[PDB]
Ligand SMILES: Nc1ncnc2c1ncn2[C@@H]1O[C@H](COP(=O)(O)OP(=O)(O)O)[C@@H](O)[C@H]1O
């Protein structure tokens with residue numbers, strides 16, 4: 001008939017809307033998770049640099065006792 | 071007829087699938103955003119303590135320099 | 141000199157929204173028209189059933205009358 | 216008062232008052248003089264049947280369209296069509312109504328100037344404005360960006376727009392449209408035995424094209440399938456009986472859009488002129504144009520074109536961009552719906568070409584600020 | 587651009603073969619206006635500019651103010667949508683990037699070459715534009731030899747005929763030893 005065709009059109013328009021929203025949400029989620037894992041790597045690097053600076057501080061804290069002994 | 075019923079049902083099913091997929095992606099995005107915010111808030115303090123360690127190293131290196139040159 | 145559009149304010153993506161909103165209204169009016177139309181047209185099937193009863197009775201009447209005329213004519 | 220949103224088009228004149236959803240009167244734009252002699256006296260035979268009246272008496276007329284490719288080639292017939300549209304299909308005198316005509320891009324100036332001169336002198340309207348047929352189709356979609364491919368019946372043009380700023384250097388106008396597809400279908404039907412020659416039978420071939428033809432998703436596979444099985448052969452009943460069976464002519468007629476070499480045209484199909492029109496745009500608005508490709512016009516109503524075009528552009532475009540093709544169900548009247556929306560705006564109410572302005576600068580006012 | 591503005595009168599050239607016809611029209615008819623606005627005003631009132639031209643099959647065409655609008659794109663690249671400045675201002679910018687002591691010599695020895703600089707009346711428009719841009723004291727001179735089109739090739743012949751240049755060629759044995767990347771090396 002005619003109205004059945006209108007119902008068929010409507011039942012696909014909302015499908016297209018949902019698919020578009022799903023694609024947008026997937027892209028946003030992937031971008032956010034990539035940024036989060038990059039920040040995780042940044043935090044690991046910062047921890048490593050803190051450890052290295054603490055090592056250098058341990059060296060220049062060992063030096064003063066020998067210096068006083070000198 | 072027959073094909074109309076199953077076609078409409080399949081369209082509705084796929085619309086619901088897209089909706090749930092978008093909801094899941096939104097939840098993952100919220101989780102990633104929270105993780106990123108928490109990571110940054112503590113990474114700033116990590117950088118601050120790294121700078122404090124660096125300044126401590128600077129002074130604990132200035133002292134042995136003078137002591138050796140003393 | 142090209143046409144420089146004067147200073148407006150709005151709108152977008154809303155009049156299309158309200159125009160597409162009445163799809164449900166259109167579907168309802170179409171389905172109502174279809175239902176009432178089938179209901180107000182199928183009665184002609186009953187009317188033609190009446191036509192069939194009238195033709196059946198007239199055919200019986202004409203068979204009887206033609207037999208009567210054949211009886212009354214062949215002398 | 217209310218504005219008259221007329222839309223000349225080429226093949227179907229669509230008109231109606233501003234602010235509605237659909238045009239009030241849609242009828243073919245053909246004017247056909249009778250060609251035989253005529254023996255009955257007092258039958259009340261007129262000298263020219265225009266509009267939808269000449270699609271019922273077409274058996275003894277010689278229909279001739281007054282608009283060839285966007286441009287108007289026969290001004291007297293076009294004036295007759297306009298007079299019919301105003302007085303008999305809408306029954307509103309033009310002395311009390313603004314008009315909003317539509318015109319294809321890159322058309323000759325003289326056509327537009329003559330159009331405004333007619334509207335101001337013969338019909339004597341209060342004020343008229345001429346708008347490009349693609350901006351309206353972009354209005355109707357409710358967008359503000361996007362590249363619109365308006366494949367009418369006369370001419371196919373592809374106007375890209377971003378944020379409301381049209382890009383005049385990226386308009387790609389191609390003269391292949393529905394009429395050439397009708398002629399090509401009428402030419403390939405002769406391969407089965409059916410010969411249509413008369414200008415009246417062109418209408419029958421047009422009906423065949425509308426009701427049966429479809430655009431194939433992949434051309435070679437369809438050509439191979441139609442040559443082995445017989446699941447495609449759809450039959451159609453002429454206006455007098457003698458049903459005909461269309462085989463692989465079904466998807467070969469509208470394939471001309473994507474391979475204009477079929478009718479001898481050099482240019483590339485509508486799948487590649489859109490990509491070229493995009494690539495002429497700046498490098499930073501190509502993603503938005505990729506995502507908001509809009510279809511309009513009558514000829515884009517073939518079943519299965521919104522998938523073939525998307526497949527082709529996805530093949531051409533870079534793999535990362537998302538290609539989306541907007542194909543609203545109200546494609547045919549998209550330009551007129553957009554015209555109604557534009558005429559109903561308050562901000563637009565001072566852009567009309569008022570009659571006193573025309574009296575002061577002549578018909579060349581249309582090229583001036585009031586575009 | 588000429589093929590695109592011819593459509594404003596009714597003449598449509600689309601085929602890649604008809605691009606050659608439009609090129610011939612451009613070569614034979616177009617000229618560069620000394621002052622653009624005055625020419626646009628004159629061509630819109632009189633009809634002393636409309637020159638006709640016969641296509642390869644008849645049907646003569648009449649070019650109006652398309653004559654000086656096609657080559658005007660050189661001085662206003664905004665016509666074809668290009669952002670950059672015209673050939674009248676990129677020369678001045680190229681001069682101003684040079685050192686402060688050789689600007690007078692460059693001002694006095696501006697050279698034109700190449701085919702497209704053969705439009706009738708360009709050596710005056712360019713001089714007027716640069717004189718407008720440049721300081722009032724410097725003398726602006728534009729060298730426009732009549733053999734402009736083949737200027738590059740004549741110079742090439744002169745360079746190849748020199749004795750001092752005879753040892754700059756990229757000899758084949760050198761290419762065999764260093765590969766095609768030899769061209770970027772000392773033998774430029
Ligand atoms: N449902 C359809 N399927 C296929 N082709 C169609 C359909 N409707 C119209 N057409 C083609 O489109 C043309 C009408 O296009 P239209 O948009 O009216 O042109 P215009 O831009 O001049 O109004 C007709 O000539 C016909 O060939």
Ligand SMILES: [Mg+2]
Pocket residue numbers: 224225348365367368512513550
């Ligand atoms: Mg149209």
